[PDB]
């Protein structure tokens, strides 16, 4: 069966032309590490690349690079085959010819500064007729020969000379041009694109392979997320690297010309894909199109709204398309469209965290070189509310401060502009400080939906309730079987109490992260913003986002805040429901165990909650967490000061054992005044970076006791209350 | 490198035809405080001024005035070179004529009355083809001489004459309506406006770099505040 072909997998890699592979595949082939190996395409056309070692990307696949991707013809999902060449390849002279389909408004010599640095230090083997991207002069331009030297032998070398005409070639239809978007030009959302992966490349990879089995593939695809959140792209990728025709239109081009001949161009937008099979169709925007819940007003607005449902209920088999349409907001799309054969199936984008934003920094600013001392990972971590689109225009918006502090000074008037300075606009730490600043974010207030940063390191002590949650919700997932196999369903859900300021949400926080799993933020503030607001409507959602997202935990923070704004133990006439208690739980009873979420409790007074909450089947686990022990605060204290330097004549034992009545939050507030009080001397001395002893003494003065007597009684009272494992402790069975 | 331009930004000043640079500036072209200095610009024209000592407006930059902003042809944001001429210049005879585009409904001596006290203790030079604007009776007018004795050797003194004619000329489309709107026009909002002019400055006078680069600019500009704040002058000055 000729054992060697090789499925086609998108790399991981931000270099030059260089494919991964795996280590059986070393010597199946007998190739050494650094050799040059050359791969066989389709359309009769080779390549030449370099092999790379790695275990952890998969068992049996190759990640090839977006070079090569568009050089060798070959899209994802696809069949290649690979070889060995270990010929000795020595180059002597290569011809530059770039294409004026991109080279515009950019004179100059640009083969003397802009090849000469990306070429050394690399050892890549070049081939006649090679399309590569390279960077530089805040700009991106392809190359291509068109004669040369017969390939093979081309070898980068210095011994190799260069020569130009300065006469561009016109492009042909038989290539592909490259600065379209590609599958890697998307950062920030890995999990949410694997989806599309399994959705969108069978039935369009494979139009006969479905046109010959009775499985009917999605009709509708329906994408989510805030605006801007990168939904146009997404759809503009997964359709100009499939071979697959792409048509656009948008939510307001059908809305903006007279009535009557809009539904026309609806109608034939449908028509002229099916005759460019296999094809797709893209709403940028729907809410705009289909508002049938509160306008009831317009015509014409149920005439385009009954004729998208009647062009997409009449999609029958006959030949391959893929309608996708995204918006902002779930709840604003029509839900006669979320019918079946119609938009069965959703998925949904959420704002990418500090690993997510990180990779989104530099697939915008790879067009432009940074200096020695210019960062993006310190620089993401400050940003927590700014949507995909927000890091793009706060990039291109930093480039124009860098380049105004030199351009006032260099006055530079003319016409044509040279690429020898362009390129040497590099940015420094003043503009990225004054960008963000400036920048105003879209996504603040959207539901918090992130991966902590917080391990079991960050929280000192509580090894009691660490076995209790390691062996509650890891063993269901790791072992379904076993569950299975006795005939009972896992837990639901863990509702703890306890004195306020003890790291309520670090343990919800840290229990994702090493679980592998997704992490929601429902705080007591954004559950009291539907009290008064008299929309039950908002915390329908908020399950179903968790739910998408699988695995998820949910997390609930003061959950009898509301309590306190109605009273409390007798308060008002009532007792202790409202419009919110009611709703909480009557969305998790009919949700199914078996999917894999879970729901965290977090509260402070535990004799207000409802008992209906603390029923059987839906939060039945109960732990107290008490105030922490001598043996565990030093753990708390140097979790803290990890980050700020510490002395080696510090003390940690004895600072943490005169403390009795502390909570955690009581010694990281002292942490925070000793550490502050410190900048005041290092300040003070200026008309030194570590920290001494001399800060402590005047930082404990204002060490302050929230956690009183009174309520250390009460809580214990109530944890023995319903504790009650007295009388029948200690028992030997007869048999 | 031709170490003489200059960047061109906005005065401070409220007076007539005046310049305001740095202190490096004085001693770099070996100038002293009151002395006529003179300007070169585009479209093959002069101009003449009076350099102003200043330490607090910048480090690197001039503070050029609106009268020979027009007059000159320069628009904010261009290059600019200045250059010292210590020749002494004394005046004997100015020919006045006023354009009928703005001088309408006026009648009688507007040259007795008007331009007189306005000149007086100024010193002031002038140039063959200069645009300032001065104001007395409730409104503003130009001026513009056709025909004088050639530029330089003119300068403000009591021992100049006058001479009236009475018949205004027509203006062509070579010059700008100096009457419209500038920068200095808008007053009250500065820390607003330096965010405008480091917005449209760039993607307007400088096409061609934008073109070359992979920078998007911003495409729309959304302005605030209560009606009558000012938003329709700013967008009709920049
Ligand atoms: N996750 C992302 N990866 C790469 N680029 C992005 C991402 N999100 C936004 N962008 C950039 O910002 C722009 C956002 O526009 P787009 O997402 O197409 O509109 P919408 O946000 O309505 O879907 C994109 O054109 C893209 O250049
Ligand atoms: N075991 C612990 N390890 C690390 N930090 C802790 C620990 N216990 C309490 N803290 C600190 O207490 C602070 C309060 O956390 P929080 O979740 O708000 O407490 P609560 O559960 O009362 O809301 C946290 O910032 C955390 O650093
Ligand atoms: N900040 C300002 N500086 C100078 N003139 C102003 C200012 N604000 C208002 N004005 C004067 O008052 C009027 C303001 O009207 P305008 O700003 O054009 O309408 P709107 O206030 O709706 O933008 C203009 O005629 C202008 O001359």
């Given at each position: 069966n000729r054992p060697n072909r090789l499925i086609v997998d998108e790399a991981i890699?931000?270099?030059?032309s260089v494919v991964s592979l795996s280590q059986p595949k070393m010597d199946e082939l007998q190739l050494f590490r650094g050799d040059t190996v050359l791969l066989k395409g389709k359309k009769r056309r080779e390549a030449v690349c370099i092999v790379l070692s790695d275990d952890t990307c998969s068992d049996e696949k190759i990640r090839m690079n977006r070079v090569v991707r568009n050089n060798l013809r070959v899209r994802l999902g696809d069949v290649i085959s690979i070889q060995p060449c270990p010929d000795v390849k020595y180059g002597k002279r290569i011809h530059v010819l770039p294409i004026d389909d991109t080279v515009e408004g950019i004179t100059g010599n640009l083969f003397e500064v802009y090849l000469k640095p990306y070429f050394l230090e690399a050892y890549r083997p070049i081939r006649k007729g090679d399309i590569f991207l390279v960077h530089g002069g805040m700009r991106a331009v392809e190359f291509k020969v068109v004669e040369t030297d017969p390939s093979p032998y081309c070898i980068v070398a210095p011994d190799t000379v260069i020569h130009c005409e300065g006469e561009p070639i016109k492009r042909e239809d038989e290539e592909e041009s490259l600065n379209e978007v590609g599958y890697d030009d998307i950062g920030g959302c890995r999990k949410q694109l694997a989806q599309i992966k399994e959705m969108v490349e069978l039935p369009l990879r494979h139009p006969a392979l479905f046109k010959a089995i009775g499985v009917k593939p999605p009709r509708g695809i329906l994408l989510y997320g805030?605006?801007?959140?990168?939904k146009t792209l997404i759809a503009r990728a997964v359709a100009n690297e499939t071979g697959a025709f792409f048509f656009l239109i948008n939510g307001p081009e059908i809305m903006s010309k007279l009535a009557g001949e809009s539904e026309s161009n609806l109608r034939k937008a449908f028509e002229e894909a099916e005759k460019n099979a296999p094809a797709i169709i893209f709403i940028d925007e729907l809410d705009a199109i289909a508002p049938?819940?509160?306008?009831?007003?317009?015509?014409?607005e149920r005439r385009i709204v009954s004729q998208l449902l009647t062009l997409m209920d009449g999609l029958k088999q006959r030949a391959h398309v893929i309608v996708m349409a995204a918006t902002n907001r779930p709840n604003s799309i029509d839900p006669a469209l979320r019918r079946f054969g119609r938009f069965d199936r959703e998925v949904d984008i959420g704002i990418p965290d500090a690993t997510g934003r990180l990779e989104i920094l530099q697939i915008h600013t790879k067009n432009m070189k940074l200096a020695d001392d210019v960062d993006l990972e310190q620089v993401a971590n400050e940003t927590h509310g700014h949507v995909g689109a927000d890091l793009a225009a706060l990039c291109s918006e930093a480039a124009l401060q860098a380049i105004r502090k030199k351009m006032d000074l260099i006055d530079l008037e003319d016409e044509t502009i040279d690429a020898e300075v362009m390129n040497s606009l590099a940015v420094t730490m003043d503009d990225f400080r004054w960008a963000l600043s400036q920048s105003n974010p879209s996504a603040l207030r959207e539901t918090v939906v992130e991966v902590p940063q917080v391990t079991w390191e960050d929280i000192g002590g509580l090894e009691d309730v660490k076995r209790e949650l390691q062996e509650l919700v890891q063993y269901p997932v790791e072992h379904p079987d076993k569950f299975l196999k006795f005939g009972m369903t896992p837990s639901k859900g863990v509702l703890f109490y306890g004195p306020p300021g003890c790291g309520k949400t670090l343990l919800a926080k840290a229990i994702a992260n090493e679980c592998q799993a997704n992490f929601i933020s429902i705080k007591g503030p954004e559950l009291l913003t539907m009290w008064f607001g008299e929309s039950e409507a908002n915390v329908r959602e908020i399950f179903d986002k968790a739910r998408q997202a699988a695995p998820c935990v949910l997390f609930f923070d003061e959950?009898?805040?509301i309590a306190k704004a109605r009273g409390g133990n007798i308060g008002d006439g009532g007792g202790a429901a409202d419009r919110v208690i009611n709703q909480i739980l009557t969305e998790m009873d009919g949700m199914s165990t078996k999917k894999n979420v879970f729901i965290i409790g977090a509260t402070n007074r535990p004799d207000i909650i409802d008992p209906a909450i603390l029923r059987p089947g839906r939060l039945d686990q109960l732990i107290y967490i008490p105030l922490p022990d001598e043996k565990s605060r030093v753990a708390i204290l140097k979790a803290n000061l990890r980050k700020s330097p510490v002395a080696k004549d510090v003390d940690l034992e004895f600072l943490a054992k005169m403390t009795n009545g502390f909570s955690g939050a009581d010694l990281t507030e002292i942490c925070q005044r000793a550490c502050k009080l410190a900048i005041r001397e290092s300040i003070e001395s200026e008309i030194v970076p570590e920290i001494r002893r001399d800060h402590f003494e005047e930082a404990m003065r204002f060490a302050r006791r929230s956690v009183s007597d009174n309520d250390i009684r009460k809580y214990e009272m109530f944890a023995q209350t319903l504790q009650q494992s007295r009388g029948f402790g200690s028992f030997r069975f007869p048999s």
């Open positions: 890699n931000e270099d030059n805030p605006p801007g959140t990168g049938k819940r509160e306008k009831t007003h317009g015509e014409v959950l009898d805040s």
